[model samples]
Target: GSPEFMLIGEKSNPEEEVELKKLKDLEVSAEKIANHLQELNKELSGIQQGFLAKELQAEALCKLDRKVKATIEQFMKILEEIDTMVLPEQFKDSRLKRKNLVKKVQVFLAECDTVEQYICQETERLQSTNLALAE
Candidate 1:
């Protein structure tokens, strides 16, 4: 006799209800991630303005830099947390969809970080140039 080839049909049970709950949780998580990214963008905009305001005084640069760095750290922490998240297997199996979501999150964060770094660098350059001019 040939060995039986058992095909496992999709198991629809109470667990499916539980999976639905998990899916809802995943959606909530995604929404929270989106909101956080929006706030990060707003903070980055303020920081960009702060860099422009640096011409007024070194103190302004220092204050803005501190605030921007603090906010960036917070944003980075949130990104790290999201990166560690283990979504349910069903969610992960669709590589293209999962990747698109992940890429969206990553690109937003990367752009924010890049803007922040540029602002910081410009502030430092201004301070150094100002000191050299004074000397």
Candidate 2:
């Protein structure tokens, strides 16, 4: 004889599935942020190498410098947007998950700040080097 089964079985746990989905979404978002940062770095490198050479005229170099600065500013704006994005309310209400997401964003912001500083410093160096060559 088979054991008796309950008339009504418990429903499946939905919170675990929801948490998994949230984690996947966060992973994708993090990847997008990383890809953006990589592109920004590549562009900054190209600008530094292509236009910062002493052979380029001061006026033309300055124009390129401004363009590079603009790109950096745009990247920074994107980072700001990422920083401001909040996790879904369902996820946010959980203290542990919410704290983890906040930490991840904070680390990403720190990385963004470091990259921005590098770009700015390189641009300033190029400008000074170009000016010195002009003398």
Candidate 3:
């Protein structure tokens, strides 16, 4: 009925082709997520050093803490989405690549967890220190 929509990418027998295209799209998104993981790692490392030097302001640290936690939540959701994705048997290569990418993400996620734990503790420490100063 909708001729315009039908004419956009006219492939009469595009079942496999459409699926293949979707797989590539998924792969690109996974790669982007992986890049964010590394960027978050670097940011966490810098935050740690700032905490150690007592150079980071309390408010700023707390804000960064929240931001990182939320970003981690988003990362976990995307990982879960990829993990639950189902591909046909013919797309074994694509499936395997996704599996490997998830493994790499997990490794990086573990490190982020460690750094985040320390940031949480430091945030608490800074809060108490300031409280005592104001009393």
Instruction: Give, for candidate 2, the lowest lDDT window spanning 10 residues.
Output: 89-98
Highest lDDT, which number? 3
Q: Write the per-residue lDDT of candidate 3 for residues 61-108, one digit (tens) a residue.
A: 666666666656655765687878877776556667667767655764
> What is the C-alpha lDDT profile of model 2 across 26-130, one tens digit per residue?
646665766766785576557656654454534444454454455445445544654665556444434355456556656665665555555445555666633
Q: What is the C-alpha lDDT of each candidate?
A: 0.56, 0.56, 0.63
The total number of steric clashes, by the backbone 3 Å criterion, in model 2 comes to: 0
Q: TM-scores of the models, in the given order?
A: 0.46, 0.47, 0.54
Clashing pairs in 1: none
Weakest 10 consecutive residues of candidate 1 by summed lDDT: 91-100
> Who is ahead in lDDT, 2 or 3?
3
Error of model 3, residue 21, in angstroms: 5.1
Least accurate stretch of 10 residues (summed lDDT) in model 3? 126-135
Which residue pairs in candidate 2 have backbone atoms (N, alpha carbon, C) closer than 3 angstroms, thus clashing?
none
Task: Residues 1-135, candidate 1: write the lDDT tens digits.
Answer: 866655756565566556456545544565665476568657756765655454664555455555555554544555565567665655443334444545554664565566556656676777763334555
Leading candidate by TM-score: 3
